[PDB]
Write an enzyme that holds these catalytic residues in place. Structure first.
Site, PDB file in Angstrom:
ATOM      1  CB  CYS A 130      -6.880   1.421   1.130  1.00  0.00           C
ATOM      2  SG  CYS A 130      -5.454   0.823   0.565  1.00  0.00           S
ATOM      3  CG  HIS A 173      -3.248  -0.551   6.377  1.00  0.00           C
ATOM      4  ND1 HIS A 173      -4.602  -0.591   6.108  1.00  0.00           N
ATOM      5  CD2 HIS A 173      -2.705   0.131   5.380  1.00  0.00           C
ATOM      6  CE1 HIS A 173      -4.851  -0.021   4.935  1.00  0.00           C
ATOM      7  NE2 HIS A 173      -3.708   0.457   4.505  1.00  0.00           N
ATOM      8  CD  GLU A 174       0.576   2.029   5.609  1.00  0.00           C
ATOM      9  OE1 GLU A 174      -0.406   2.802   5.993  1.00  0.00           O
ATOM     10  OE2 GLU A 174       0.704   1.730   4.425  1.00  0.00           O
ATOM     11  CG  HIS A 177      -0.029  -1.490   1.463  1.00  0.00           C
ATOM     12  ND1 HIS A 177      -0.964  -1.762   0.520  1.00  0.00           N
ATOM     13  CD2 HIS A 177      -0.567  -0.566   2.250  1.00  0.00           C
ATOM     14  CE1 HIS A 177      -2.000  -1.004   0.699  1.00  0.00           C
ATOM     15  NE2 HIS A 177      -1.783  -0.297   1.765  1.00  0.00           N
TER      16      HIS A 177
HETATM   17  C1  LIG Z   1      -6.093   2.436  10.006  1.00  0.00           C
HETATM   18  C2  LIG Z   1      -5.339   1.543   9.111  1.00  0.00           C
HETATM   19  C3  LIG Z   1      -4.257   2.383   8.437  1.00  0.00           C
HETATM   20  C4  LIG Z   1      -4.857   3.262   7.416  1.00  0.00           C
HETATM   21  C5  LIG Z   1      -3.835   3.740   6.381  1.00  0.00           C
HETATM   22  C6  LIG Z   1      -4.613   4.366   5.237  1.00  0.00           C
HETATM   23  C7  LIG Z   1      -3.797   4.922   4.080  1.00  0.00           C
HETATM   24  C8  LIG Z   1      -3.172   3.787   3.326  1.00  0.00           C
HETATM   25  O1  LIG Z   1      -3.702   3.357   2.325  1.00  0.00           O
HETATM   26  N1  LIG Z   1      -2.032   3.261   3.785  1.00  0.00           N
HETATM   27  O2  LIG Z   1      -1.372   2.265   3.087  1.00  0.00           O
HETATM   28  C9  LIG Z   1      -5.436   5.484   5.811  1.00  0.00           C
HETATM   29  O3  LIG Z   1      -4.857   6.380   6.363  1.00  0.00           O
HETATM   30  N2  LIG Z   1      -6.731   5.340   5.805  1.00  0.00           N
HETATM   31  C10 LIG Z   1      -7.692   6.139   6.572  1.00  0.00           C
HETATM   32  C11 LIG Z   1      -8.331   5.242   7.639  1.00  0.00           C
HETATM   33  O4  LIG Z   1      -8.691   4.041   7.396  1.00  0.00           O
HETATM   34  N3  LIG Z   1      -8.432   5.741   8.880  1.00  0.00           N
HETATM   35  C12 LIG Z   1      -7.959   7.043   9.355  1.00  0.00           C
HETATM   36  C13 LIG Z   1      -8.526   7.207  10.746  1.00  0.00           C
HETATM   37  C14 LIG Z   1      -8.800   5.779  11.229  1.00  0.00           C
HETATM   38  C15 LIG Z   1      -8.998   4.910   9.983  1.00  0.00           C
HETATM   39  C16 LIG Z   1     -10.479   4.516   9.710  1.00  0.00           C
HETATM   40  O5  LIG Z   1     -11.144   4.026  10.891  1.00  0.00           O
HETATM   41  C17 LIG Z   1      -8.681   6.806   5.649  1.00  0.00           C
HETATM   42  C18 LIG Z   1      -8.070   7.054   4.256  1.00  0.00           C
HETATM   43  C19 LIG Z   1      -9.962   6.017   5.559  1.00  0.00           C
HETATM   44 ZN   LIG Z   2      -3.076   1.155   2.626  1.00  0.00          ZN
END
Ligand SMILES: CCCCC[C@H](CC(=O)NO)C(=O)N[C@H](C(=O)N1CCC[C@H]1CO)C(C)C
Ligand SMILES: [Zn+2]
Ligand SMILES: [Zn+2]
Ligand SMILES: [Zn+2]
Ligand SMILES: [Zn+2]
Ligand SMILES: [Zn+2]
Ligand SMILES: [Zn+2]
Ligand SMILES: [Zn+2]
Ligand SMILES: [Zn+2]
Length: 203
Positions: A130, A173-174, A177
């Site tokens: 996150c 996820h969104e 939030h």
């Molecule tokens: C997958 C659930 C949605 C994730 C959204 C988050 C960003 C965020 O905080 N959204 O509110 C992100 O992109 N996070 C990435 C993330 O969790 N990812 C990106 C690729 C797949 C997944 C980790 O397995 C990174 C920052 C770690």
């Molecule tokens: Zn998030």
């Protein structure tokens, strides 16, 4: 206010606009937007999508110091409104060819909600990270496998859409939030890697 800062024409959203764990806005229920949208709400949605594109672009991510992301919700910029952006890339093949569709989902969604879902659950095998959380948090974030959502676009048009896989996970996820829910809220309290039989683990 925060919104006025973010919607200035020359302003590019960066990590310093993203509030962190512990800020109370992350735990509120975000307010519904009304149509027709104000200029500020329209602009914010565009700037949010711009941030994701930047975040995904090696150059701009590096210029602006961005952690890569695939979705962003207004509460993370200190704006308690039901506005999310999602930008989920398809991947190149092994020969280096770009995918047919650049994105499996690309949307700015106003007043989104989950209206039905599968009985089956899913989690990403690598867990979730996150933008507002600067800690390592292990474990399976257990979501619905499949969801039907409704949402509005910036023109006020109503969409109804069924999602699965990674797309499902990201929207969930969104949505969380804008309800004040954090990903870790859905990690088992006693063994973060527990698997209830039938959990769809996504690779
Ligand atoms: C997958 C659930 C949605 C994730 C959204 C988050 C960003 C965020 O905080 N959204 O509110 C992100 O992109 N996070 C990435 C993330 O969790 N990812 C990106 C690729 C797949 C997944 C980790 O397995 C990174 C920052 C770690
Ligand atoms: Zn998030
Ligand atoms: Zn800024
Ligand atoms: Zn516009
Ligand atoms: Zn740009
Ligand atoms: Zn239900
Ligand atoms: Zn649910
Ligand atoms: Zn309906
Ligand atoms: Zn916990």
């Amino acid at each position: 206010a925060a919104i006025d800062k973010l919607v200035k024409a020359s302003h590019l959203i960066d990590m310093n606009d993203i509030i962190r764990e512990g800020n109370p806005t992350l735990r509120k229920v975000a307010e519904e937007v009304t149509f027709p949208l104000s200029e500020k709400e329209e602009i914010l949605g565009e700037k949010m999508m711009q941030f994701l594109k930047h975040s995904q672009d090696p150059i701009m991510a590096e210029k602006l110091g961005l952690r890569g992301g695939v979705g962003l919700a207004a509460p993370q910029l200190d704006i308690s409104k039901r506005i999310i952006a999602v930008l989920v890339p398809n991947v190149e093949d092994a020969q280096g060819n770009p995918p047919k569709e650049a994105y499996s989902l690309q949307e700015v969604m106003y007043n989104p909600k989950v209206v039905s879902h599968s009985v089956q659950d899913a989690a990403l095998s690598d867990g979730e990270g996150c933008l507002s959380v600067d800690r390592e948090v292990p474990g399976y974030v257990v979501r619905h496998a499949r969801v039907t959502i409704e949402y509005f676009d910036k023109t006020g048009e109503k969409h109804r859409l069924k999602l699965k896989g990674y797309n499902s996970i990201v929207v969930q996820h969104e949505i969380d939030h804008i309800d004040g829910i954090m990903f870790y809220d859905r990690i088992n309290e006693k063994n973060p890697f527990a698997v209830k039989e039938g959990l769809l683990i996504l690779e």
